[PDB]
Design a protein around this ligand. Structure first.
Ligand SMILES: [Cl-]
Ligand SMILES: [Cl-]
Ligand SMILES: [Cl-]
Length: 837
């Protein structure tokens, strides 16, 4: 690496409620709320009615302190920097009697030279966190109006004044926990000569034959003298040098700008998930002075091109991604913070979440703008899993201020995070905000504010989203696409706008539209659509008692944050399912409902390529135990939707679609290769396993790379009776010329409530060892949308939420580090017929 020494200030911290004089142990990085929880000074914030009970914390100020030793030798190093990767938010930082910083932006990392204020022996660091509520009350009082931030769960919408994670004040899926603290690491670096303030690997060009790179370094030299140095860049792959370049300089006191070209011949390209390997080169920059390497910095680099194509065309304006010159249909989801208390999210949790994305065949994730700019680990995982990242800036749902001081805070965060993130292969584009223009146009603020205030809002929008942010991206990330808002034009209430750019089509859920509307209401790119579900019982049990098991109980409503609530789930369920009498059965069918309905839309989106070029559902994940649009609950359990997304996103998909009493079958491929001489085989099978009629065979089919094509159409009239339609399914198989199966699907000709499902007992055999439970399931008769339920939190399944076909055994592997040999995992198999009489 280099000759610097890093001291992590991650132990020895204490905290206190301001005014109390009482100090207790703290964990840093951490939060005031977690520190209080650790001392049983708050209840479990996520349980029952406890959200009201934890609100007091936001009204108090909080102090943190630690002490650390510095030696004579350390004190004698040329430079010593104190780095706060994150302070939430209004934090006065004192070291040894010096005010080093008045922090005011959660999203900025602060590097502070401290050599002149450190002392040999004990050093004392004290941080005073002003309540972000008390800090901004006078600011709100001066404002003369209240910003229309419905997601800020307080009478006074103070969130807009503070550059602090918007969701911490509440959200339409989220608890209000307006926390404070040292939310990312604190480090002290002792070093000689200089540090590399920034290392940016600019890709000038990329072809199959050559990659031309520009290594741009910003070096901050901390000594009085002019220092001869050699700058070196080494490019390696898998531990072996590919190319090395060097440059002689003389570093001047202060900032030095150094640029070294490098080329990689016959480069190995980074490919997104499903299209090959996400190959990452190791680029290491070193500053050598005499025999010593005084500074080094590396990045993993992926050699690829990403172009967002957003052009007027015959259908309106396209919106799609071209990766390595090939249009890539986007498949993924919107990501929100993984917890109400950010430092509680563990490395393992990030890894597992990326495994969930990769295993569901996703190639994109939107880091949505009411959260945070994520930690470095998130982007590293996206790099090594081949998942493109759409990065919103952290503005969502409300217009914001646009006064000079505010825009200066924003500029600081934009520069910091663009420089922090711009070397990531996964980073694909920047988006100014979530839904703010939509709010300004379509919520009638014309009549909620004076004309003067509304004009100020409109001018302010331009200053921030059409000027400051795009100028900053042009300066610091010139090769990446920026759009001022998502959706930039299309509105879900205006069918005429859907051909223009990306859609957040909230007809389903907010508009109460049936899932079938997703077949007709097509976007050019779906950047949000969604449907809610209660999480499964083991998660409900984590926030509620049995007395609370009613969909509109005080506790269930306390764990619903949308402007339309839990009753809407029953309303949709009734359209397609028999409503179960028991709460547990309702919850099960509700998982099934969300998975089925949403899969129908994901299928519509893919089926309608190239008109539509992507789908990111709302939402991947949860920040707490809640009723929400997520596909994975807060404890990491895949809902039915996550399995259904995996299926709907499979590289090759057979998509039967039935409309107006006619069946069409589409072959959909995101493979890079064309498949030739394929056979589609179909047969009707009743619920007892008996084939009805003859097999239908469609031979000599081509499935070209990156296409969706209809290969079969048939009217139901004259093929199946209405009676067969309620008591049979279609089995579909796609095989190559030699007979090897590449895809399979099952189609039902009627709504589940209209199916004549037979009572059936699902049997299974279990083989349990450490970490693993192997189940073989069997039923002589169809068991519809089986859910294999286990009480073990976060247990992983090879499959779940599938139809168990008559007489066709099914193997399922359940895994968890907590499965023990000889400690039988409880298993409860649910299926649709069991939910009613
Ligand atoms: Cl210094
Ligand atoms: Cl306000
Ligand atoms: Cl220079």
């Amino acid at each position: 690496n280099d000759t610097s020494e890093v001291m992590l200030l991650d132990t020895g911290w204490e905290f206190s409620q301001s005014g109390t004089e009482k100090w207790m142990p703290a964990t840093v990085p951490g939060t005031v709320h977690q520190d209080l929880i650790s001392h049983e000074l708050l209840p479990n914030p996520f349980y029952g009615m406890n959200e009201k009970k934890i609100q007091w914390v936001e009204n108090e100020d909080w102090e943190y302190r630690t002490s650390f030793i510095v030696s004579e030798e350390q004190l004698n190093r040329d430079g010593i920097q104190l780095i706060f990767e994150g302070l939430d938010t209004y934090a006065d930082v004192y070291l040894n009697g010096s005010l080093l910083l008045k922090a005011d932006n959660m999203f900025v990392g602060y590097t502070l030279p401290v050599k002149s204020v450190l002392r040999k022996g004990e050093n004392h660091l004290y941080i005073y966190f002003h309540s972000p509520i008390r800090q901004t009350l006078p600011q709100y009082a001066s404002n003369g109006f209240n910003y229309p931030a419905d997601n800020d769960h307080h009478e006074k919408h103070l969130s807009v004044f503070s550059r602090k994670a918007p969701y911490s004040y509440g959200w339409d899926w989220g608890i209000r926990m307006v926390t404070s603290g040292v939310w990312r690491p604190v480090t002290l670096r002792f070093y000689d000569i200089a540090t590399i303030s920034d290392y940016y690997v600019r890709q000038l060009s990329l072809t199959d034959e050559n990659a031309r790179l520009s290594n741009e370094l910003i070096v901050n030299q901390i000594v009085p003298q002019k220092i001869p140095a050699e700058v070196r860049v080494n490019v390696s792959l898998n531990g072996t040098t590919v190319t090395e370049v060097k440059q002689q300089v003389t570093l001047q006191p202060g900032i030095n700008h150094i640029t070294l070209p490098a080329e990689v011949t016959n480069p190995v390209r980074w490919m997104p998930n499903g299209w090959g390997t996400p190959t990452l080169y190791d680029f290491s920059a070193q500053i050598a002075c005499g025999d010593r390497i005084v500074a080094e910095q590396s990045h993993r680099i992926g050699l690829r091109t990403i172009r967002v194509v957003n052009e007027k065309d015959k259908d309106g304006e396209s919106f799609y991604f071209e990766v390595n010159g090939i249009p890539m249909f986007a498949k993924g989801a919107n990501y929100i913070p993984q917890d109400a208390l950010l430092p509680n999210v563990t490395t393992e949790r990030y890894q597992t979440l990326f495994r969930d994305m990769k295993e569901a065949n996703m190639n994109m994730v939107r880091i949505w703008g009411g959260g945070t700019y994520e930690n470095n680990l998130f982007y590293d995982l996206a790099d090594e899993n081949g998942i493109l990242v759409w990065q919103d800036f952290m503005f969502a749902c409300t217009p914001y201020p646009s006064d000079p001081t505010f825009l200066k805070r924003v500029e600081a965060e934009a520069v910091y995070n663009i420089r922090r993130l711009r070397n990531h292969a996964s980073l694909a584009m920047w988006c100014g905000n979530n839904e703010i223009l939509e709010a300004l146009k379509y919520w009638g603020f014309e009549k909620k504010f004076t004309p003067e205030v509304y004009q100020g809002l409109m001018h302010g929008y331009d200053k921030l989203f059409r000027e400051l942010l795009p100028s900053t991206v042009k300066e610091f990330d010139s090769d990446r696409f920026y759009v001022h808002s998502s959706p930039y034009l299309a509105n879900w209430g205006r069918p005429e706008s859907w051909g223009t750019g990306d859609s957040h089509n909230w007809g389903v859920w907010y508009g109460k539209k049936p899932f079938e509307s997703l077949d007709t209401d097509l976007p050019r790119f779906m950047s949000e659509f969604g449907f809610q579900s209660f999480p499964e019982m083991k998660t409900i049990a984590a926030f509620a008692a049995p007395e609370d098991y009613q969909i509109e109980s005080e506790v269930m409503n306390a764990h619903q944050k949308s402007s339309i609530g839990n009753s809407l789930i029953r309303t949709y369920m009734e359209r397609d399912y028999i409503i179960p009498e028991s709460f547990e059965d309702f919850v099960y069918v509700g998982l099934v409902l969300q998975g089925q309905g949403m899969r129908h839309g994901l299928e519509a989106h893919r089926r309608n390529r190239p008109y539509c070029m992507g789908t990111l559902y709302w939402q991947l994940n949860d920040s707490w135990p809640v009723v929400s649009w997520s596909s994975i609950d807060y404890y990491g359990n895949w809902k039915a939707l996550h399995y259904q997304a995996k299926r709907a996103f499979a590289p090759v998909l057979i998509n039967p679609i039935q409309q107006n009493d006619s069946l069409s079958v589409y072959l959909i491929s995101d493979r890079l290769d064309t498949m030739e001489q394929m056979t589609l085989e179909m047969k009707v099978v009743d619920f007892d396993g008996k084939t009805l009629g003859k097999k239908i065979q469609v031979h000599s089919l081509e499935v070209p790379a990156n296409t969706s094509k209809c290969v079969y159409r048939a009217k139901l009239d004259g093929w199946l009776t209405p009676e067969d339609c309620r008591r049979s399914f279609l089995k579909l198989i796609l095989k190559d010329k030699s007979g090897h199966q590449v895809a399979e699907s099952v189609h039902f000709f009627r709504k589940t409530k209209d199916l004549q499902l037979p009572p059936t007992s699902v049997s299974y055999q279990m083989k349990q060892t450490d970490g693993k439970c192997e189940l073989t399931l069997f039923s002589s008769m169809l068991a519809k949308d089986i859910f294999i339920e286990t009480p073990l939190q976060g247990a992983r399944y090879s499959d779940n939420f599938f139809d168990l076909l008559p007489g066709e055994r099914k193997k399922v592997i359940i895994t968890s580090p907590r499965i023990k040999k000889g400690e039988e995992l409880p298993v409860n198999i649910k299926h649709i017929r069991e939910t009613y009489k």
